[PDB]
């Protein structure tokens, strides 16, 4: 969906779109999608653009441009969501968390997890590293 982004990327993206829009229609050419992304720091090579128009005629409207930035931002955020989700598990932050620490903080997180689900969770996997916890979460 598009609720993954806050207000403040969307108000910035309409700021970039209405700056380089042609006549206020909400239209840009297949050149201007390149210059509107390099105006904000993001510098993709032309294969990254090459698939998104094939994904969406020559008329790139503002809901089409908003959906392409949402997929361009969510893939790196879905790859990096899980490390900061791992940070409250260990006290130091290198990735090493105790097994005795993990049965009161993971049964109390608010998804109605009982004592039985985290007991199945850790014995289908001392202290375990960080990259194994992605290996055991995504499965």
């Amino acid at each position: 969906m598009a609720d993954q982004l806050t207000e403040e990327q969307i108000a910035e993206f309409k700021e970039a779109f209405s700056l380089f829009d042609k006549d206020g229609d909400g239209t840009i050419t297949t050149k201007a999608l390149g210059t509107v992304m390099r105006s904000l720091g993001q510098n993709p090579t032309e294969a990254e653009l090459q698939d998104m128009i094939n994904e969406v005629n020559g008329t790139i409207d503002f809901p089409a441009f908003l959906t392409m930035m949402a997929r361009k931002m969510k893939d790196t955020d879905s790859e990096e969501e899980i490390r900061e989700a791992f940070r409250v598990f260990d006290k130091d932050g290198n990735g090493y968390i105790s097994a005795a620490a993990l049965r009161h903080v993971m049964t109390n997180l608010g998804e109605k997890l009982t004592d039985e689900e985290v007991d199945e969770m850790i014995r289908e996997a001392g202290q375990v590293n960080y990259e194994a916890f992605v290996q055991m979460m995504t499965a």
């Binding site: 969501e81 998804e111 979460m137 499965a139």
Partner: protein
């Protein structure tokens, strides 16, 4: 390129090329412009070009670029190939390999107690150290070069009565010295540097405050494998003229250090001030049993450890010998020609002390077993201190093991009785680790920074010797006692119940295929004085040992996502 051509173009085009020269040799037209050249040596030669450079291009500016990247790529690659082969020193021997060890050693100098960037080169040198430790030696004099910085290093102790030369330059030094073992060249001016280091370090333990490190103090023992001034009259100063059977070596302290140790053992010596020098040099007194066959002075080797055991029998305190216990490695070599057939008192010294330790542990275990008055304040008293006795217990057990690895033949043969006392008192872990003592089981630090690790593993070596003096005929009741102990009948509360078990029954199979040998190997006694006790010995003992070897030895995709 041509070197990477296929087998088809490397057999026919060469034929198209080899025969042309053969045509040239027709009518006398000669035009000229499996020797082990060794690509490995060529790689070393390719390294030599880098070795001939190195300090020629870097130290010419470092001691006064993109080229400073090859050292961070070749040095890492040298740590593998040298450790990968480790068998080149067997067939095609070449001294060219030994050259690079010294050619880099000069480059590893500059600041042999500081330097910069990486220190992994010292570890890389340790890898090449294993490769080394007729021609053999030639233009090098590395040992002579080793005597350079090591000389004033003796004054470094007097300069605080050089900071990494006793670390980095002493790493490969203590390594290659202790890594020698196999081969042995000679001893040209090595004893000169040794005596300049030995006698210097023999009195360097007197300087208080800064006692430096005891690591290099074990390096003297590591180098104690060369050959034969404290008293070197016709060996040091008065020997610049030009090595047979000169009956004089460590005889300057042959009986002297023996009497010194005997007096040191006679005294309490229960302090860090005690030994001190001996605590950092008398570990090299055991290396003298090398060239002297096994032990010509057998009684000396049968007392030096006993007197050393007396120092251990003196018993340390809290911390005390926390780091002063790593010398047990050398202790696992003094038991080589251990002709300690005497033992007895020394056996009792290993028994009564352990029994005293068992009493001390019982004084601590029962202080934890009979203290459940709801108070976690005893965790500092009952526990914690248990680790102090635990680490102490993990010192004598590492010595009695090798002792029992030779005193089992004649011990199990002929008779017994002697080791029977040890077996009856070997219920240490049985009255601790097997007695549900979680605190004693809580080695933790002892289990980590000091499963299967001693404690009860040592009992397995004598478990057979324990059952050896057991039933020389009818067992049976032991199985009933095993079931009795399984029902948890205390201890002596089962023996009385075991006292009422009819009698021993055996008159069928086996027996003559078992007790026949026992009726010719025993020849001791037979009465009702035994009853349980001897039967109640290994009964409850192997019972818990069996328990130690018994049982002791979904939320789907979309919901995973929420928890993530």
């Amino acid at each position: 390129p041509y070197d990477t051509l296929t087998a088809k173009e490397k057999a026919r085009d060469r034929e198209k090329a080899q025969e042309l020269l053969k045509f040239l040799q027709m009518n006398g037209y000669a035009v000229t412009r499996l020797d082990t050249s060794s690509i490995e040596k060529r790689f070393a030669f390719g390294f030599l070009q880098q070795l001939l450079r190195w300090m020629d291009i870097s130290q010419e500016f470092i001691a006064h670029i993109k080229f400073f990247a090859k050292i961070l790529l070749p040095l890492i690659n040298q740590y593998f190939t040298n450790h990968c082969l480790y068998f080149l020193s067997t067939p095609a021997k070449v001294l060219g390999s030994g050259g690079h060890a010294s050619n880099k050693e000069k480059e590893m100098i500059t600041s042999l107690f500081c330097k910069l960037a990486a220190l992994v080169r010292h570890r890389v040198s340790l890898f090449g150290t294993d490769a080394p430790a007729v021609a053999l030696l030639p233009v090098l004099t590395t040992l002579f070069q080793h005597i350079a910085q090591h000389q004033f290093g003796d004054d470094v102790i007097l300069d605080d009565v050089c900071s990494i030369y006793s670390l980095g330059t002493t790493k490969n030094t203590y390594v290659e010295k202790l890594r020698p073992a196999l081969g042995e060249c000679l001893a040209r001016l090595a004893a000169a540097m040794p005596v300049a280091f030995l006698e210097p370090q023999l009195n360097e333990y007197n300087a208080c405050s800064v006692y430096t490190t005891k690591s290099p103090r074990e390096r003297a023992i590591l180098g104690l494998p060369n050959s034969v001034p404290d008293i070197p009259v016709l060996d040091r100063l008065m020997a610049d003229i030009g090595a047979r059977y000169t009956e004089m070596p460590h005889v300057i302290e042959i009986t002297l250090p023996m009497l010194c140790s005997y007096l040191p053992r006679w005294w309490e010596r229960g302090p860090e001030a005690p030994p001190p020098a001996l605590p950092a040099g008398a570990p090299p007194p055991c290396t003298a049993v090398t060239s002297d066959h096994l032990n010509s002075l057998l009684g000396n080797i049968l007392r030096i450890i006993v007197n050393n055991l007396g120092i251990d029998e003196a018993t340390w305190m809290k911390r005390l010998a926390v780091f002063a216990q790593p010398i047990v490695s050398r202790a696992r070599p003094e038991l080589l020609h251990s002709h300690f057939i005497p033992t007895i008192g020394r056996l009792r010294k290993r028994a009564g002390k352990v029994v005293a330790e068992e009493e001390q542990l019982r004084l601590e275990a029962k202080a934890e077993a009979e203290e459940g008055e709801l108070l976690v304040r005893d965790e500092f008293s009952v526990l914690c201190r248990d680790l102090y006795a635990l680490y102490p217990l993990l010192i004598r057990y590492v010595d009695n093991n090798r002792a029992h690895w030779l005193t089992e033949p004649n011990a199990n043969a002929e008779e017994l009785f002697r080791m029977v006392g040890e077996i009856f008192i070997y219920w240490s872990k049985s009255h601790n680790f097997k007695r549900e003592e979680q605190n004693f089981v809580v080695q933790n630090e002892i289990n980590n920074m000091s499963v299967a690790t001693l404690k009860k593993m040592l009992p397995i070596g004598l478990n057979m010797c324990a059952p050896t003096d057991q039933d020389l005929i009818m067992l049976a009741k032991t199985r009933y006692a095993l079931k009795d102990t399984d029902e948890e009948v205390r201890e002596f509360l089962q023996n009385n119940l075991h006292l009422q078990g009819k009698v021993e029954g055996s008159p069928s199979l086996r027996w003559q295929m078992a007790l026949y040998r026992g009726l010719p190997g025993r020849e001791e006694d037979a009465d009702d004085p035994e009853k349980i006790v001897r039967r109640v010995q290994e009964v409850s003992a192997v019972l818990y040992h069996l328990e130690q070897t018994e049982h002791p030895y979904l939320l789907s995709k979309q919901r995973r996502r929420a928890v993530v």
